[PDB]
Design a protein around this ligand. Structure first.
Ligand code: MET
Ligand SMILES: [Cl-]
Ligand SMILES: [Cl-]
Ligand SMILES: [Cl-]
Ligand SMILES: [Cl-]
Ligand SMILES: [Zn+2]
Ligand SMILES: [Zn+2]
Ligand SMILES: [Zn+2]
Ligand SMILES: [Zn+2]
Ligand SMILES: [Zn+2]
Ligand SMILES: [Zn+2]
Ligand SMILES: [Zn+2]
Ligand SMILES: [Zn+2]
Ligand SMILES: [Zn+2]
Length: 238
């Protein structure tokens, strides 16, 4: 009734929501955060009706989820970007890549494709022109003989000792104890197309609960919380 149940991955959405509880209480609502540890279940729960909203994804991921699963869900206002970061225990600069080196990448086709294009933009390889999805099979030039290890996203943090470098979502990196200042060698450009945001059932588009959530999530308090906790790795888009 006056309870809002939001599903979220701990970092950054879960902890942001937790610190916004008092502000939500000021709007006359109680907030409960349901923790999820993966990118699949939060949307199921949302479409099932178990949660009022979720905070873990960007709109492109949601659109792909809607296409594959037929969820009746929707992206809200852009909140913050979480640029992909390339981590390494073995080198400090992308200039230090050499023959035989291995990069761990997600087996998600969109993430994989996007990661390969990041590596292209820094001159490490070349891909065919266009905007379609690319894979390691499509690499035209590969000067430094970089091999790619395609893994489940949950496995990538623990792979860092066994590979040269790895692309890891901040949602996975931070709870795994990875420090981007210490071990990050490349951060992806800011692109608000990939801004994480609140998602909710299309039916609840104009409901007060979603309205309350998006108010507090775009507040000055929300901005300062993001900046104070993540300092550079999660960037507000409001
Ligand atoms: C579940 S879509 C990926 C979300 C992740 N925090 C990112 O922006 O990279
Ligand atoms: Cl809670
Ligand atoms: Cl319905
Ligand atoms: Cl309703
Ligand atoms: Cl203001
Ligand atoms: Zn806290
Ligand atoms: Zn207040
Ligand atoms: Zn809680
Ligand atoms: Zn899970
Ligand atoms: Zn309903
Ligand atoms: Zn509702
Ligand atoms: Zn060095
Ligand atoms: Zn350089
Ligand atoms: Zn202000």
């Amino acid at each position: 009734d006056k309870k809002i149940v939001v599903g979220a991955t701990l970092v950054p959405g879960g902890e942001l929501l937790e610190e916004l509880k008092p502000l939500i209480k000021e709007k006359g609502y109680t907030l409960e955060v349901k923790n999820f540890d993966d990118y699949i279940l939060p949307n199921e729960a949302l479409n099932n009706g178990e949660i009022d909203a979720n905070l873990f994804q960007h709109e492109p991921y949601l659109k792909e989820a809607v296409k594959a699963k037929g969820y009746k869900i929707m992206a809200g206002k852009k909140l913050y970007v979480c640029p992909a970061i390339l981590y390494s225990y073995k080198i400090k600069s992308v200039d230090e890549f050499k023959k035989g080196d291995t990069i761990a990448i997600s087996n998600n086709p969109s993430s994989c494709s996007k990661n390969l294009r990041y590596l292209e933009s820094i001159g490490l390889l070349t891909l065919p022109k266009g905007d379609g999805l690319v894979s390691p099979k499509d690499i035209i030039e590969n000067p430094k003989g970089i091999q790619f290890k395609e893994l489940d996203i949950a496995q990538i943090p623990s792979s860092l000792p066994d590979v040269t470098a790895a692309f890891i979502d901040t949602t996975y990196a931070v709870p795994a104890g990875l420090d981007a200042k210490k071990n990050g060698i490349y951060t992806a450009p800011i692109n608000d197309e990939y801004a994480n945001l609140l998602a909710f059932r299309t039916e609840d588009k104009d409901s007060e609960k979603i309205k309350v959530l998006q108010d507090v999530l775009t507040s000055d308090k929300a901005r300062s919380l993001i900046e104070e906790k993540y300092k550079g790795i999660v960037i507000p888009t409001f």
